Amino acid sequence: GEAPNQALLRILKETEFKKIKVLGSGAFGTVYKGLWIPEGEKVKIPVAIKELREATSPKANKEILDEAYVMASVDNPHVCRLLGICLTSTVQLITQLMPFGCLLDYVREHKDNIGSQYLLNWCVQIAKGMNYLEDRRLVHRDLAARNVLVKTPQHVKITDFGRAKLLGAEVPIKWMALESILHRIYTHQSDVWSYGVTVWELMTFGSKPYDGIPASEISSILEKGERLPQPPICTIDVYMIMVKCWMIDADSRPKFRELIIEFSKMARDPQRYLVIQGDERMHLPSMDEEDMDDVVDADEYLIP
Ligand SMILES: CN[C@@H]1C[C@H]2O[C@@](C)([C@@H]1OC)n1c3ccccc3c3c4c(c5c6c(n2c5c31)CCCC6)C(=O)N=C4
Numbered sequence: 001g002e003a004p005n006q007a008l009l010r011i012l013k014e015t016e017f018k019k020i021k022v023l024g025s026g027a028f029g030t031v032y033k034g035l036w037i038p039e040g041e042k043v044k045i046p047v048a049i050k051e052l053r054e055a056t057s058p059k060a061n062k063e064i065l066d067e068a069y070v071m072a073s074v075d076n077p078h079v080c081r082l083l084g085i086c087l088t089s090t091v092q093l094i095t096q097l098m099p100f101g102c103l104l105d106y107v108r109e110h111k112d113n114i115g116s117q118y119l120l121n122w123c124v125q126i127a128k129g130m131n132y133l134e135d136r137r138l139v140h141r142d143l144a145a146r147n148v149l150v151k152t153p154q155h156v157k158i159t160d161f162g163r164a165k166l167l168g169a170e171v172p173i174k175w176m177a178l179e180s181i182l183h184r185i186y187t188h189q190s191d192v193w194s195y196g197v198t199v200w201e202l203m204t205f206g207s208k209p210y211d212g213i214p215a216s217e218i219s220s221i222l223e224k225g226e227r228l229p230q231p232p233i234c235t236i237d238v239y240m241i242m243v244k245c246w247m248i249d250a251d252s253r254p255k256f257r258e259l260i261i262e263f264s265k266m267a268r269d270p271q272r273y274l275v276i277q278g279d280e281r282m283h284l285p286s287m288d289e290e291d292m293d294d295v296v297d298a299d300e301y302l303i304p
Contacts, residue, residue, distance in 0.1 A: 007073040008303065010084030012036070012094060019049060020288065023101075029053050029064075033097060035295075036083065044294045045301055046097035046287075047083060056090045063162065068093055070161035074136065078129030080149060080159040081298045096298035098157065099287060100150030107145065108206040115282040116233075116270030122148075122156050123199055123263040129158040130195060131256035134188045137167045141186050143194040144175050145201040151299075153284040173215040174208075178248060181219045189250040195259065196245025203231040203238065203274070235273045237266065 017036040024031040029052040036045040052064050071082030086092035100106055103122070107114060126148055133140055140158065147160040167188060173181065175197045177190035197209055209228060213221060227246050230239040241262055247253045254262075266273040271280075 005073050007075075009068070009072050010303070012038075012084040012086045012092075014086055014088055014092075017047065017049070017094070023048065036094065042294060043296045043301060044291070045083070045296060045298055046099070047298070048095050048097050049086075050093040050095065051088075051090055052093075054090055061091055064091060064093055067161045070138070070164045071095070074133070074138075074161075076129060076132040077155075077299070078125050078157050079132060080157045083298060096151070098149035098151045098159075100153065100285070102146055103148040103150050103156055104145035104201060104206050106150050106153070107202055110284070111205040112278075113282055113284055114205070115279045116274035116276055117267070118153060118284065119202055119274060120263055120267040120270050121154065122202060124260055124267055125156050126158060126195065126198065127256050127259040127263060130191060131260055133158070133164075134191075134256055138164050139167050139186050139188055140164050140191055140194075142172060142175075143191055143198055144172060145198050145206065148198070151297075152286060173218050174210055177250065178219065178222050179250060181222075185250075187250060188256070189253050192245045192253045192256065192259070195256070196242045197228070199238075199245075200228050200231065200242055203234050233274050233276050235275065238273050 016038055017034055019032045019034040021033045022030065023033050029050050032049040032051070034047050034049045036047045037043070038045070050064075052060055065085075068082060068085050071080065074082075080098070081096040083094045083096065086094060126143075130140070130143065140161070141163040142160050143158065147158065148156050149159045150156050165186070172194075175194040177186075177193035179185035179187070180190045180193075200209065201207065210218065210221070227243060230236070234242075241254070241259070245253050245259075
């Protein structure tokens with residue numbers, strides 16, 4: 001039996017928040033950095049406002065509203081915080097601002113400053129995010145480094161719920177389990193597979209999986225028993241763990257709760273598990289106008 005989902009969908013006034021700079025555009029919608037001054041409360045909240053690609057085809061609204069449905073029903077430090085929606089014309093989704101953006105980009109744009117303590121910490125945090133979705137019986141179906149966002153370089157969060165489904169219910173080829181490519185079976189275990197690939201994107205500083213190999217070939221490669229190569233920086237311990245996420249027997253893959261444990265152990269001696277050139281000596285970052293006196297982060301903004 002299912003418990004009743006008593007999350008709150010918060011409807012926001014367009015006047016309660018001011019935009020400030022475009023962030024993303026084209027591909028689908030149109031994201032903005034902005035601030036959100038709820039009602040009368042004397043707080044300001046860095047937000048991302050995602051108003052979808054103008055022209056408002058009934059198909060598009062029912063699609064972002066599901067995202068918001070899902071995002072409103074999740075609550076975990078490692079899953080992207082949804083603040084509310086706004087019913088304007090085209091429908092604004094309002095989420096917590098992740099100032100550092102896509103984690104796939106972050107790693108590409110910072111290789112030379114990223115060290116094992118960070119890489120292993122991201123691994124744990126995503127494993128936690130995923131374990132939590134599991135707890136709430138959700139299957140993400142689109143885990144990848146492009147779908148993890150960076151709030152600060154020590155703190156990442158899983159995003160993109162535009163494909164999430166409940167387990168038991170009813171295309172990014174290079175991240176998918178094999179049961180998924182062949183029979184569209186998706187399970188929490190098909191999520192572990194893609195975790196495997198996400199981790200590999202991170203350890204190779206954001207390479208592209210099976211660069212070259214075009215998508216039609218993939219199921220065949222995998223069925224023959226080929227997997228992605230061991231990244232240069234990876235000890236066999238780390239790489240062994242990727243490999244197990246890529247087993248064919250789904251039930252032989254590990255569980256997110258185990259990944260948490262394993263990376264967490266490794267995260268206590270980072271340098272034993274990832275061999276990075278110039279590791280010891282590496283520091284990373286920690287946000288515009290001046291009226292930043294009343295700014296609180298969404299993570300510290302809580303609702304009764
Ligand atoms: C390639 N990478 C892009 C950088 C960026 O535009 C994109 C389109 C891309 O990401 C994957 N994008 C989104 C696309 C679809 C849904 C949400 C976002 C998105 C968000 C945020 C983004 C930021 C930045 N993008 C943010 C966001 C760029 C740096 C500031 C933060 C953010 O804080 N919350 C959501």
